[PDB]
Symmetry: D2
Amino acid sequence: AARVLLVIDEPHTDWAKYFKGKKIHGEIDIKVEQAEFSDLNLVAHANGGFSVDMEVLRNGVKVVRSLKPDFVLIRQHAFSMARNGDYRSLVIGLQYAGIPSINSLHSVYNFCDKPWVFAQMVRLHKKLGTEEFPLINQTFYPNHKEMLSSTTYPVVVKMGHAHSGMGKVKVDNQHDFQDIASVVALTKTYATTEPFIDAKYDVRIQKIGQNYKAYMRTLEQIAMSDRYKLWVDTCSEIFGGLDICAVEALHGKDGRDHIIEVVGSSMPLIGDHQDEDKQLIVELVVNKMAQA
Amino acid sequence: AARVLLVIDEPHTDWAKYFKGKKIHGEIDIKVEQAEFSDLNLVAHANGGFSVDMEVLRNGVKVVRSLKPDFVLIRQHAFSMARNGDYRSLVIGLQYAGIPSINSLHSVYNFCDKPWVFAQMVRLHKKLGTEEFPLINQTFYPNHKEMLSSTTYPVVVKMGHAHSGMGKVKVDNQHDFQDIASVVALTKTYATTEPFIDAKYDVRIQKIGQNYKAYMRTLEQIAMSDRYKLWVDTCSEIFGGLDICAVEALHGKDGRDHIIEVVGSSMPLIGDHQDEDKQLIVELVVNKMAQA
Amino acid sequence: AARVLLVIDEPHTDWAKYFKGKKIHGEIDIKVEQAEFSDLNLVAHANGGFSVDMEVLRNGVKVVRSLKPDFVLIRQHAFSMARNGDYRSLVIGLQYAGIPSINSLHSVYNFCDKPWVFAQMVRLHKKLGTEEFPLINQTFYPNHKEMLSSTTYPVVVKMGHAHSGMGKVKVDNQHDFQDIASVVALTKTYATTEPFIDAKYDVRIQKIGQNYKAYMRTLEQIAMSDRYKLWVDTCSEIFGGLDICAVEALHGKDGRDHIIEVVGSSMPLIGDHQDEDKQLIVELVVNKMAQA
Amino acid sequence: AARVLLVIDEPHTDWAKYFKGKKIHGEIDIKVEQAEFSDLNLVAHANGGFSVDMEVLRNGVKVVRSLKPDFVLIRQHAFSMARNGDYRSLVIGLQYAGIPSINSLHSVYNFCDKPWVFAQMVRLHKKLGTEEFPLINQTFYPNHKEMLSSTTYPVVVKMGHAHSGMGKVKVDNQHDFQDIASVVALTKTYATTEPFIDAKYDVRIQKIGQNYKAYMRTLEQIAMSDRYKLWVDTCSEIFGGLDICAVEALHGKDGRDHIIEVVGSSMPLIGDHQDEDKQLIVELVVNKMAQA
Ligand SMILES: Nc1ncnc2c1ncn2[C@@H]1O[C@H](COP(=O)(O)OP(=O)(O)OP(O)(O)=S)[C@@H](O)[C@H]1O
Ligand SMILES: Nc1ncnc2c1ncn2[C@@H]1O[C@H](COP(=O)(O)OP(=O)(O)OP(O)(O)=S)[C@@H](O)[C@H]1O
Ligand SMILES: Nc1ncnc2c1ncn2[C@@H]1O[C@H](COP(=O)(O)OP(=O)(O)OP(O)(O)=S)[C@@H](O)[C@H]1O
Ligand SMILES: Nc1ncnc2c1ncn2[C@@H]1O[C@H](COP(=O)(O)OP(=O)(O)OP(O)(O)=S)[C@@H](O)[C@H]1O
Ligand SMILES: [Ca+2]
Ligand SMILES: [Ca+2]
Ligand SMILES: [Ca+2]
Ligand SMILES: [Ca+2]
């Protein structure tokens, strides 16, 4: 009998290919079903029954086919303040259905608010100190109301729950801040400001299972340090543990490091070792599927 | 030197009175500041600094005074789909500020979506079975789309994140379901349906710290059973543990029990033993404040 | 190369056979080394290096083959209050070497004192109550001194750390108790006494990974109940979790159940599903080796 | 009535004095009973009942006073490979009785084998690396057999479970090692060897609740660093958390640090802040008693 694995990722990565031939316990097979959040819906019952639905809008003359995932691999963000970018209810649905996931549905749900994720890093930074965990000094505003100034400009204003260079605005002076603050008013949501950094380079320390990779972009893969490993291990324990994650830090010309954030299972696969990470992810997923 | 405790509760319960005279370690005092979510705002910095602001709109000619809580006691819900009922960003803010809380800010944040909370109960029901944990068979719909019927009517449709008999609608037949489903469309959010229950009575098993109380409403305080205690202990471990919580179950005339939900630190204090529970809550809060 | 798995079990079970062909990630091979605690020895260094030297003196004087386990499966018992029965320092050694194990080395070490294990069950019985967890009312005596009388006869005296019918003695009266008490003096160790159960039949609820089996003896497999499953799940969480375990309970002639103990990874495989359980254990071990 | 706290410590510290006037919840009183492991005895029953009988033979033959601790504070060491040094069965007894403790009875029991405790530090050193956690490179020998040579001289041989300068021996050459190895044979127990550190000074980073203190000896208090704090926080999480602990490290003449061990609730109070730490311990104990 087989095992269905739903991979929530943009069409771009042919997951069925990578899971080709992998057998759970060396004998059971894995049917790989893949779709984006937008093309999915579901009904979950507390007694156990459920049904996920595929293709709200896509090729195969739409139609919409339901399946029953035994496991889910979420490679896509669940929240985005941009129109239609609200799949949080789908995550809740999957959790309600009791479907095992990577990363855990719990973490995926708690990753829906960036400052909520950053708040975890704040706790770790509090415990560890700047010498161990140089977390940029960000400021969180529940809403633009007391959003009045910035101790040092330029400052980087990150609005709502954004990603992909979006929601980011670099402010250079007081008068320009007040305008962006008024724009934050119209967004009817929270924002954060952080000192802008004159960066010599930036790093991203990733961890997939027990695998660590450090890349430097200015994309040169550099070597891991106990310091780097501390950053990522620390962050990998949040929301009960993150199977796939990375910590982005900026190394300023001044030689000071500043950790800006931690990303979950949606972490974009970068570098030369593309397929390599995809294989690691496959091994991890197959193994968790075997433990169900 | 003293300790400020912010209690987020409606003006109705004079908390300052109950904390009167209680001293941390038998010597430090507790200044009790109390406000509703609506009258509060804050700025939190990753370096540690922060400022909470009181009275967005209230007596004392408003003005707005800031304080610095050393601890928070959240006795109010953080989310409500009704207008202005969105303080989730305040919770995030408090967490960002690193302020200890009861219940934990983590739990308070995860309690913002009822079906997300119910999903935890589903896991426990899955593990334990109906003989140990008779959780009503609820159905979750991410959105009204496949919301087509109900195996048995009447059915109780609970819309969005509601509370206080609001968002609840008892549906008696198919045609009436389809209308409510169309109304769920306009709410642009999720809903749940569950078999309606012909109840002989209902129970609420509460747990405050190590104190358990069982009440029956039809408000008679009844005795605790190992069965009741199992229900509440089980639920008290979710989202990393809930210091104050209760499990509501309906006992149908048919002698079958059905657990409908678990409530957090906002759990309304009921019964005769009103002040009593308030004292227990005070002892718990003072003790957690001492461990900081 | 391949992956070495050391299985600490009597030679009476050919583990290499069961692991035959099983490949980690469907590719890496598993070399199965098997020996008995008595034939094992090692050295572990904090920098990481180590060696587990198997000394099987099977003809040819001192026969020693060095090996380096990647994982351990402990199916034999580590501590026994008898000659040639203390292999606790080997467990410590393996932990010191950092070798992954099933069950965990932590649990295997904490299972070295039966009443210490029973003490965990006492905590669970205190939380759950007799209705949920009917743990026999045993009495622990750190030594013979306080061992003056029993409040029930017959009584079953269990001396120190004994197993497989050893160290157990049923006393029928006061005079006979005082004699056994003087014998406990001579053991220079602790003892426990418990009411004797004139039992119709005894049950053993086992759990290997996510598999549950209930057997009755008077062997005959019976069906699992939520009650049975509660017993074993509860016990499976002790010492940080037990991958393989079982709960033994006696259903007296009184018509009620009595939990007498919980056994770890050394739990004897019984019934007709011996080989099936052996496979379940194999699948579990291979999977944990894959996560290492 | 009041609340009984049994403090297991040598009479050289008048605990009743420090707990004088301290009231649980500002109301309930604390009766402080204090004795030494040797003078203690008990009986514990699974149904809940128990008794801890203090036999202080201070003039007047057999002097016994029964008592029932509500909490225990273990400041004395439980296991010692010497005559009159095994009180492990008392710890088990207390756990069996369900009495709350500081440190936890679980940790006190797992601290009975130094290399078992060291094994935890080895795991942390493996995760963190020498840069973050410079744990001396110790070697564990389950027994004298494999104890053929050391890769560095001088070397420090620590026999079995010894403390307070006991069982430690510095060997300067091969011939002298073989003699000490033959002596380890006679102990019929395990031993460890570690490179000898010609040290300028040794540090001890302590943590009592949320208080950190660093002392240097050549005693002199020095300031805490994020590095120091990392060492102690890391160690404070072992065996489920240690309320009172310290990490001893030697800063050699080589110019680098070496962590040699972590001590539990029996950690000797040193420095000039002995009384301050005694108060910190008192505040911690009273608070945990309040949560019970
Ligand atoms: N505080 C800062 N100071 C200076 N440069 C910054 C700062 N924060 C971000 N940047 C740069 O802006 C890029 C994108 O902003 P991010 O905070 O990473 O948000 P994002 O929307 O996740 O963007 P991507 O997908 O990572 S490029 C980073 O990769 C940095 O090079
Ligand atoms: N499935 C059901 N079948 C029958 N009666 C129900 C059902 N669910 C709820 N009720 C009743 O409706 C009341 C309120 O609905 P709840 O689910 O408790 O929502 P709520 O908005 O939290 O309401 P309160 O504050 O507890 S009255 C309960 O106290 C029950 O008496
Ligand atoms: N209090 C008791 N009353 C009656 N029968 C008992 C009692 N304790 C043990 N027995 C029986 O004796 C068997 C063995 O004693 P246990 O306490 O289970 O330890 P053991 O001798 O190590 O067990 P095994 O199964 O032989 S390895 C049980 O399986 C019971 O059938
Ligand atoms: N490898 C070593 N090299 C050099 N000095 C050492 C070494 N091990 C221990 N020492 C010293 O010996 C002291 C005591 O040995 P420990 O391993 O700490 O055990 P101990 O004898 O129980 O300790 P205390 O503090 O006397 S209770 C340390 O505090 C060091 O100063
Ligand atoms: Ca980013
Ligand atoms: Ca309710
Ligand atoms: Ca047995
Ligand atoms: Ca020491």
